[PDB]
Symmetry: none
Subunit: 235 residues, 3 copies
């Protein structure tokens, strides 16, 4: 009975798997600047379990350990983090980018006809430029609008996504946490908004319950919106 | 000399290295399944059974694991070498001819892809295109531009409705893959690229797929992987008469853990 | 007896090799079996297959002799002395011309063989597959031709990756610029031939070939790579020769498709 059922190499391969899985499924960290690592700070976590006979076989038979449950937990944690970033938490009195008070709004418009999305983005950028924030811009869209921007038409000679990217030098991305037809344009920069991270996504041992081994993947972060006028939501 | 008596090793170290390198190089360039799946292993040739599910958890108690186990099959192909050829290679200082090993490795790779994509119902194995519990979308019409884009969009939406968010990989039959590369007037863009911004894990073609068919998979280690016990290798079977038989072989298995992460184009 | 030293010989051989490499097309789509040595003169053509009187066993494979391709050039003694005294490097243009002619001969032999000596080529093999050429002036003709060729090759169990070799006229026609098209067909064709699309000047008229690569289908048996040799002393001149010896082996004729 000890507080470390894993060796050093197994720990390294579990932690690198967690980091690698978290890296490829995060969208909110690609438009924000990280202020850390270091008002209540929320904690996001997900648990998984390991069988003791599997560890005994891995160490005795000289075979690699299976780390799929950690990958699943990390994917769920990344989904939770994106949900918190985009929509916040009403129970804790937290606001996201899509619900911040004092943000500008524009009508979504007709997107079926070619050029509608470009007109909407231009109108949002125009309203943003009126309030003193002028570039660089980043655009986040729901899967429906993102797929609709990739339609192929005749005599257009260019994909509308590149026409949009001409304006949004930071980038245009798709997010699954957005519901229905939704989009957001943000003026990037640490002076407008940022993310304060207290503890990165890491795995921790909880102690042996019965004879099996529980582990938890967890992290702690907060979103600080200093200027609410640098966000324009399509609705 | 060295052929007048029974011997355990007819080749020297350099030619064993060259043969194994040839086998590996031939194997790597003709495998499509390994470009979209994670690898669990190598586990060792002594491992013959592997779990299929994920671990969940007055008198005495009896505990029995609820996971399902399965045996790992072997894929192999044989070839033969002439003894005078080896004698001439050693005596005249000539490189040895290793084409038969390349042919055997190509056949083994084809068999591996066939097992991965369609399985084997006689032995109880399932493939990506025959799994039970997978999703399905109509194929539609791919003669006009935009049909493939619409089909992929519909498949991605149905995958998203079940909590699988990507990134996605697409595998197509040669006919659909060729149709995706056609050229039309005023369009100025190929539909393959437009599809490629929707599947960030890649779009591939496989000759194992039949007629007009395709599969979209939400990649992830927790959804599916490949359990490998032994990669392709060459072994000496022992001299029969005076010639030398060899075998190229491998052992692996496909594990489908979430069947609803697959969408086939029907 | 030889009018050159180690460094001059090395420079001559280096120039010959560099001229040879840049101009050889068939060596970019074929595997090499060798070098085997200058003493090897015969090579097998097929793959090996396994009382009161003694037994007699004979091999069932076929064998062929390896030919030699060569070209002669000259070097003058006064220029050698001037280079040695001045220390300026020698003039080696004749060797480059000889190497270019040898490369042309090798490419012609690979692509068309020699009917008199019973040597086959890719364009004249017996048992190969053929597809109609169609009309390459309008867009899509080359794409359709390559798609048909690859489909017919796939029907016989050869899955690629494929390589395409074309005559100059077809290569030029796959580079035209039409009105509101903005996409070159050569890129689309290159996206289907994973091993490459190449241009060859030995191909006659409008023609092309699609091959499925692999040592088990075809390779090149090289006994001696291109090299230079001294022929002796004649008056004051110094004759030299550039020569090589190699052969092409076709094992599966149905892995080749020609564009009729």
């Amino acid at each position: 009975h000890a507080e470390n059922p894993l060796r050093e190499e197994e720990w390294a391969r579990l932690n690198e798997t967690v980091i690698q899985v978290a890296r490829r499924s995060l969208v909110g960290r690609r438009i924000l600047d990280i202020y850390g690592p270091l008002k209540t700070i929320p904690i996001i976590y997900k648990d998984f379990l390991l069988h003791w006979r599997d560890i005994e076989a891995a160490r005795t038979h000289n075979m690699p350990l299976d780390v799929s449950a950690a990958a699943g937990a990390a994917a769920l944690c990344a989904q939770q983090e994106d949900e918190l970033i985009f929509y916040g938490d009403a129970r804790l009195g937290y606001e996201g980018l899509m619900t911040a008070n004092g943000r500008l709004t524009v009508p979504l418009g007709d997107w079926t006809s070619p050029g509608g999305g470009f007109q909407a983005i231009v109108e949002a950028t125009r309203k943003l430029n009126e309030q003193g924030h002028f570039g660089p811009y980043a655009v986040v869209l729901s899967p429906r609008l993102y797929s609709q921007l990739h339609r192929i038409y005749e005599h257009h000679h260019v994909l509308e996504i590149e026409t949009i990217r001409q304006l949004a030098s930071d980038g245009v991305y798709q997010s699954n946490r957005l519901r229905g037809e939704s989009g957001v344009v943000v003026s990037t920069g640490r002076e407008n908004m940022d993310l304060a991270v207290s503890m990165d996504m890491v795995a921790a041992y909880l102690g042996a319950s019965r004879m099996n081994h529980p582990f938890r993947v967890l992290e702690a972060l907060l979103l600080r919106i200093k200027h609410p006028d640098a966000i324009c939501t399509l609705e």
